[PDB]
Design a protein around this ligand. Sequence first.
Ligand SMILES: CC(C)COC[C@H](CN(Cc1ccccc1)c1ccccc1)N1CCCC1
Ligand SMILES: *[C@@H]1O[C@H](CO)[C@@H](O)[C@H](O)[C@H]1NC(C)=O
Length: 341
Amino acid sequence: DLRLHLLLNTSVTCNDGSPAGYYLKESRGSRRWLLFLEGGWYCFNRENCDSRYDTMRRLMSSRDWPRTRTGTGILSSQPEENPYWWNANMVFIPYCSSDVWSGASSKSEKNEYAFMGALIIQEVVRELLGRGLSGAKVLLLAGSSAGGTGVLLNVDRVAEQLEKLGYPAIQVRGLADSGWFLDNKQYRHPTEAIRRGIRYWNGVVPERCRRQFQEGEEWNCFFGYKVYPTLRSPVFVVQWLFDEAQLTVDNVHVQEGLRLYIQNLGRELRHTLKDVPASFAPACLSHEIIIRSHWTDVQVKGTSLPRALHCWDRSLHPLKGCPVHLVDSCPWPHCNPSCPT
Ligand SMILES: CC(C)COC[C@H](CN(Cc1ccccc1)c1ccccc1)N1CCCC1
Ligand SMILES: *[C@@H]1O[C@H](CO)[C@@H](O)[C@H](O)[C@H]1NC(C)=O
């Protein structure tokens, strides 16, 4: 089990001003550290954040968090469940800021809620340095859904933080699961929600991407295919070709018009990954993968995700029989037989 620690700096808070935190299981024989960002949508104004506080309160407050959590999938310490990194130091960071991990604003006389996602990540890193992270060789910042987008927005800032604190030997990398979206045409009649959220949250984006798009256009940096080329840290992208959250935003819930729409979406997703050399993109209708207990079961071209990640590790020391770029070419959901049921 992973054990809860609330942040010693109690000014870095969840939405309601309660302290943020992290769950930790140390592995003293290992120099690998895995820091996982939880997902769970977001809120973007007073009225919809109040609604979230009523029925999704664990995503806005630490007051009701349990003392422990069980690590699953890539967070499991059992080699049978996690062939990739079972001996690593494991960290699960709960999502309690509702800001896609981008916020840097405190509660105040003008602000009913605090949106501190970007500061929460930085404070977790700083406090872990006193608990063994100072000896790491590799820090993998991973995340699913809003947490996958969170990796893209924060991985280079973690790398810059460790350099400035005097730890240039730690190699920072990212693993972004189910956070690679397209700003496409909907099937029936959403970027406005991110534009509004950034202002409400005092949201921050990576500096090189910010300098490209400029004031008022920072929402562009929330889209993987636009922010990825600006990043310097190595990032492995995991994305279903027919992601259910993508389809929900597109108003898809089969005749010719919908058939063409769905096939075009898979082709467009595949196009955006052509120049992403570490990627895993199966032709399945689903959402999230890395913390599911049966994450080992899916394969692309005969290679599982745990294998592809191991081959990525080797490449950062092409490899014979050890591929890292794995994108399905078949054009319809479940054309890959290994898709989840
Ligand atoms: C997992 C969540 C963070 C996903 O949020 C999806 C979008 C926000 N977009 C905008 C978007 C526009 C077009 C197509 C897809 C998404 C978004 C964009 C990039 C990264 C995160 C969220 N919302 C709009 C209303 C409801 C959800
Ligand atoms: C606590 O965090 C806040 C916000 O990140 C920061 O301004 C402050 O310096 C921190 N306090 C200490 C003692 O580091």
